Amino acid sequence: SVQTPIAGLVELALSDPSLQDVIRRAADRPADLALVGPASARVLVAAALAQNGPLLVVAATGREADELTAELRGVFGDSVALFPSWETLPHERLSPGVETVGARLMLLRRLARPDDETLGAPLRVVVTTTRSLLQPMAPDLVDIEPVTLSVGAEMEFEDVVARLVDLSYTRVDMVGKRGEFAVRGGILDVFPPTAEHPVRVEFWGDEISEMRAFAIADQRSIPEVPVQTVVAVPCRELLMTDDVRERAAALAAEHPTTENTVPGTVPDMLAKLAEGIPVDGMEALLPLLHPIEPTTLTRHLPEGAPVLVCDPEKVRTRAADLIKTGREFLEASWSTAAVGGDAPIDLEALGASGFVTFEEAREAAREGGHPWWTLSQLSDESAVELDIRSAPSARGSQHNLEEIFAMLRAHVATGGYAAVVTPGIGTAHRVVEQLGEADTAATILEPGTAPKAGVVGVLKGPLCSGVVLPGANLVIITETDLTGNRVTAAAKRRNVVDPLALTAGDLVVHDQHGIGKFVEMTERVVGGARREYLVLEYASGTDKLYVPMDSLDQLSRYVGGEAPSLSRLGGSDWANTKTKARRAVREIASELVALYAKRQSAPGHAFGPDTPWQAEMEDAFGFTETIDQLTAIQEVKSDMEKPVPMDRVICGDVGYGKTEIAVRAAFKAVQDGKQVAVLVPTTLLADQHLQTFTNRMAGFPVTVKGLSRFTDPAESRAVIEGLKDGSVDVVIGTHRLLQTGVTWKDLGLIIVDEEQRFGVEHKEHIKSMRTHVDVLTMSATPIPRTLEMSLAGIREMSTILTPPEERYPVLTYVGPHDDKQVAAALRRELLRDGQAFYIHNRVRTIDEAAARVRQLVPEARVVVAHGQMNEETLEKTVEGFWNREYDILVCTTIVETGLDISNANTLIVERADTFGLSQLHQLRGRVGRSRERGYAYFLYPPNKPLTETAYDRLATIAQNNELGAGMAVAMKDLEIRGAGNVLGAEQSGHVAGVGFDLYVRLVGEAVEAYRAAADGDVRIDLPVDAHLPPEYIGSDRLRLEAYRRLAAAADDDAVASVVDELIDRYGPLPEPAQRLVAVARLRLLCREFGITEIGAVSASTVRLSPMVLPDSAQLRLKRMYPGGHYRATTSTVQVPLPRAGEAPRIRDLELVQWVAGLVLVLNGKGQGDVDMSKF
Ligand SMILES: Nc1ncnc2c1ncn2[C@@H]1O[C@H](COP(=O)(O)OP(=O)(O)O)[C@@H](O)[C@H]1O
């Protein structure tokens, strides 16, 4: 169907007798076959060889392997698969991505099991790289029995979790990444490395009861994704057996280092391997841990399958680079000095897993029964040269374009077949229009068909470069050849809404008491009820406060002051500290709402709907728009169209595509005749956004111009500044656009980027421009959503959480500063013509530091950059680094965090101990954003003993984790300065002592009281065994979230949604949980009638604390509930509990309901208004 688009076109291409000649030659399986043809013919040749049976194709680099893999999936779909290459060198102390290992093992198991439907269709073409071809592997990797999960299979829970542990699956309390799994009572969550969505399986007894795929963000199940049998393949290329623990204990005996275990060294690694847990960099130790004879990839191919090698010369030339780089990483990582100096393991054994040479792989493939064939673009004498010519590539000069369309017209006039293959979405109709203007009959082909004779067929399919086959009377021309651009290729949100982490000793702020230190969580019984309480230390200095589970909304994690405040006490010292800040925030809210109102009543020309060109400009997008991006463009366009001048923020990570929203909004404002500006803090951003605005808006009468610091004063004084005549439709500029001399003619839209970095004078300038014209800001720092909805009326902010393309996480390595590892990593990043960040914050020595870098890599262009330089030199240096003039940038953290160099994907942090967690995460984030995998090296000095807090900190970032250990604790800090960039106040004085969460909560109070300018807890002490049992929710961090979120639910349907959350996430509700739910609904019923407290004064009586009763309801209390009296002075209603039998007092749901009906009949309504027997 639409799954094999170019199957008909290729099936037509095979009609050429040269490809059929190749099919005949390969049909008898000859020993030597040398083919010669153009590069773009690869997809053809393979597709011919696959007609006689399966085969393995080898490409030079991973990019060519991905390209040919897609081009073959366009004709074969699921039958052709890609055997990926490791992101790490074989002996490097870093493990590759779990997704890569998953794809490798799934592909090998598919090669060993073609009949297995659950793994996929039988293989016909396997495309791989030189690395994966040369990199050996253990022959027992395919024999590892995966964890097969099906609805109805009879299994045993603990055996399943144990088997998952053996397959290098990391156990966590919440599934967030691939290769993870969480264990809950009767429910197993697991994220296989090859599955698109993580799957949750419900066990009952000794067999699975249900299966359903869920989403990572809300952790809620997706019912519209049907889940068949899932095959959980291992996540590492090894098995954690008892033998590998034995040898890890023999090797672990030497280099023991029992005390003061360094994080990244080999005593810790081998110690944890003897303990059985998987650790990073484990694969390199395969020849010593699991010693066998390692075979190559070609053995796992089904017997008889041949091997076609594309451009073998380049395959060899790169192969030498794999062997050299891998050898350098082996010597570097496992030198005598780096293994702790003691009993250095011999490297000869470790050489077993290293890359085999080209000749060894050749003879190993031939001696295994698999022929070795070649396809080379260069002409050879004894080779079978195919009748295939490459496509004419019109460089972009439209005379060549018209000539190409003319040769197409002549070819179809003769009767030959012409096909124009366009992989882009929205570009086929454009080619149809171009052919119509060139007077050529065009037709958008049905996906999977062949071009009809006499008409050119515009087809949507994956192709890079076209191919001309005169033997088949066929001419295939790709969109790439016509436009000179390569089109590479859905997305799931990553909200991850489930953490409010707490560790022992952490500081929290209680609204009614103050700052205190967390201790633990306990449970006490008062009348047969297991109750849960969270404890805090409040300096009296030994006073402990047990906050219950009904008032968790008053607990805010203390953030703000880096220096800790002193814990509060039972006195009245804290209420004042609340009140003064409460008086210090409304001053901010005043400016906020006054800006919103001045914006509301201001006169500004609205923007009409999108003109006809906007569709073509939006469809000229190289990539694919994202759902969050589409909603953001709709909101931005609508706010432009609304008469109120626009003041909208765009929140998203660096590398998520908000700049496209900028260019599209700017274009929309241009189409209505209004010129626009873009304000950036640094000149580098003016150049980047300048080039993006050029490329996206080219081909239209729109002159884009920029005014940076380095724009010469001739063009600056004349062209840019003198453009008050409508000469510029859009100007990208730095702060020079904010001086007095500037002037606009019909300024229509302002685009701000990284508004936080601007100067204060420039900030007040931009805010002054806000009221008069439409503004549109972009931010990489996120904001707390509580502030998003707290200040929603004055300033709308749209969030983008759908990644445009899967940006796989960078590979972090914590370790001692070894020069060989640094040099090896820098040279590996230089191999792909990449760049690297080297961080040495001590400015005094930065020069010397860079010199030492040049000691390690002499062929590296190394430069320095720091904040002490004047901007005229610094921005020029950073410009040189962005223009690839330099290879390694030694800089301080201030300079590094604030650059967007996409080509830089390797980071070296010297003296990583000195940096905080947040700074380390920021540093790491600035690499590995593009299509390339990033690397990060957090290094601590080896000449001094590491500190305790550096050991802990480095340990948190060591095991790369998104958990509540600190990634979330230090994410809040990333939101603090974001708030400072959003709201006007920068002072942290009132934050320190109140808590930033309570600070912006008071901000919420003030701005909600000011927004409505025109307008001008219940305690239940009942003997009801209600709690969330630990067996139901094992993880305390999640159970506290269930408590809090259940308490915060404000209506019955919200409580029901919480119930559905607990049911889906953790399983069916137990009795104490349902009783707690009924207690919450009882709290709502109290709030409707304003009851503050319902407490049992004694074992036989109950008191409703605040009620006034008129004479009618007082008499009704006497008649319907005898024995009870109403005390008007204290204004309480005290009634006695009826005994259950003739004896025990009533409890649990009988008591809850009885109290409900009592409240009802006392407050007018009948006893049959509602029942608490639900849920
Ligand atoms: N939908 C997409 N898929 C893949 N890459 C994209 C997509 N949109 C934009 N990009 C790439 O990512 C970058 C877009 O982000 P950028 O323009 O740097 O602003 P920001 O990083 O703030 O989103 C560009 O370099 C672009 O090539």
User: Pocket around ligand 1: residues whose beta carbon is below 6 Å from it?
Assistant: 623-624, 626, 652, 654-660, 692, 780, 804-805, 900
Question: Cα 304 to chain center, whole Å?
Answer: 42
Show the CA angle centred on residue 256, arms to residues 255 and 257, nearest 5°.
Answer: 100
DSSP sequence for 635-694: HHHHHHHSSSPPEEEEE--TTS-HHHHHHHHHHHHHHTT-EEEEE-SSHHHHHHHHHHHH
Residue that the structure tokens 């094999």 belong to: 4
- Phi and psi (nearest 5°) for 163? -60, -35
Which residue puts its alpha carbon closest to atom 25 of ligand 1? 655
Residues of the chain immediately before an interruption (C to N > 2.5 Å): 489, 540, 1016, 1142
User: What is the number of the ligand 1 atom nearest to the C-alpha of 778?
Assistant: 22
Distance 621 CA to ligand 1 centre (A): 11
Which residue puts its alpha carbon closest to atom 23 of ligand 1? 657
Best residue for ligand 1 mutational test, from 618, 649, 660 (most atoms within 8 Å of Cβ):
660
Q: Are 281 and 91 in contact (CB under 8 A)?
A: no
β-partners of residue 442 are 456
User: What is the number of the ligand 1 atom nearest to the C-alpha of 624?
Assistant: 1
Local structure of 22: helix, strand or coil: helix
CA distance 389 to 470: 8
Distance 656 CA to ligand 1 centre (A): 5
List of E strands, 829-901 = 835-839, 862-865, 888-891
Q: List helix spans (H) across 415-515.
A: 428-437, 479-483
Taking CA atoms, 237 is separated from 81, 87, 100, 567, in Å, by 19, 14, 10, 51
Amino acid symbol at 108: L
List of E strands, 1035-1113 = 1093-1095, 1101-1104
Which residue puts its alpha carbon closest to atom 14 of ligand 1? 657
DSSP sequence for 784-797: -HHHHHHTTTT-EE
- Phi and psi (nearest 5°) for 916? -75, 170
Long-range contacts of 181-189 (CB under 8 A, 24+ apart): 182/1035, 183/1034, 184/1033, 184/1034, 184/1065, 184/1066, 184/1067, 185/1031, 185/1032, 185/1034, 185/1066, 185/1067, 186/157, 186/1067, 187/1065, 187/1066, 187/1067, 188/157, 188/160, 188/161, 189/214
Taking CA atoms, 201 is separated from 198, 710, 822, 1035, in Å, by 10, 60, 44, 18
CB within 8 A of 310, min separation 6: which ones? 39, 42, 57, 58, 59, 60, 64, 68, 375
User: What is the number of the ligand 1 atom nearest to the C-alpha of 692?
Assistant: 17
Distance 795 CA to ligand 1 centre (A): 25
Q: Which residues of 316-336 are buried (b: 16+ CB within 10 A; e: fewer)?
A: eebbeebbebbbbbbebbbee
Show the CA angle centred on residue 1006, arms to residues 565 and 765, nearest 5°.
Answer: 90
Q: Are 502 and 1040 in contact (CB under 8 A)?
A: yes
Q: Are 720 and 705 in contact (CB under 8 A)?
A: yes
Strands 544-548 and 530-537: antiparallel
CA distance 1125 to 843: 79
Taking CA atoms, 929 is separated from 61, 487, 933, 962, 1070, in Å, by 20, 18, 8, 17, 45
Best residue for ligand 1 mutational test, from 425, 624, 656, 692 (most atoms within 8 Å of Cβ):
656
Tokens of 306: 């041949």
User: What is the number of the ligand 1 atom nearest to the C-alpha of 930?
Assistant: 12
Q: Which residues of 902-940 are buried (b: 16+ CB within 10 A; e: fewer)?
A: bbbbbbbbbbbbebebbbbbbbbbbbbbeebbbbbbbbb
User: What is the number of the ligand 1 atom nearest to the C-alpha of 900?
Assistant: 18
Q: Are 469 and 16 in contact (CB under 8 A)?
A: yes
Tokens of 1119: 């008649």
Long-range contacts of 272-279 (CB under 8 A, 24+ apart): 273/244, 273/245, 273/248, 274/245, 274/248, 274/249, 275/245, 276/240, 276/245, 278/168, 278/170, 278/236, 278/240
DSSP sequence for 600-618: HHS------S--HHHHHHH
Residue that the structure tokens 């300048």 belong to: 690
Q: Are 175 and 158 in contact (CB under 8 A)?
A: no
CA distance 853 to 939: 14
Neighbours of 901 (CB within 10 A): 22
Strands 835-839 and 904-909: parallel
Taking CA atoms, 264 is separated from 243, 429, 964, in Å, by 23, 56, 22
CA distance 1057 to 1071: 18
Question: Cα 1098 to chain center, whole Å?
Answer: 55
Best residue for ligand 1 mutational test, from 623, 650, 755, 927 (most atoms within 8 Å of Cβ):
623
Residues, the chain, total?
A: 1175
Distance 692 CA to ligand 1 centre (A): 10
Helix (H) or strand (E) holding 421: strand 417-421
Q: List helix spans (H) across 226-373.
A: 242-253, 266-274, 286-289, 312-333, 347-350, 358-366
Q: List helix spans (H) across 123-228.
A: 130-134, 157-166
Distance 680 CA to ligand 1 centre (A): 17
Distance 267 CA to ligand 1 centre (A): 43
Q: Are 633 and 661 in contact (CB under 8 A)?
A: yes
CA distance 150 to 201: 9
Tokens of 515: 């700052």
Report the candidate in 38, 16, 135 with the shortest Cα–Cα distance to residue 83.
135
Report the candidate in 872, 950, 952 with the shortest Cα–Cα distance to residue 911.
950
Tokens of 307: 């091997």
Strands 474-478 and 467-469: antiparallel
Distance 802 CA to ligand 1 centre (A): 12
The structure was resolved to a resolution in Å of 3.5
Distance 753 CA to ligand 1 centre (A): 14
Task: Count the alpha carbons within 13 Å of 801 in the hemisphere toward its beta carbon.
Answer: 12
Burial of 951 from C-beta contacts in 10 A (0-12 / 13-18 / 19+): middle
Distance 706 CA to ligand 1 centre (A): 21
CA distance 67 to 127: 10
Rg, Å, the chain Cα set: 34
Tokens of 624: 């694919």
CB within 8 A of 485, min separation 6: which ones? 479, 622
Distance 1122 CA to ligand 1 centre (A): 73
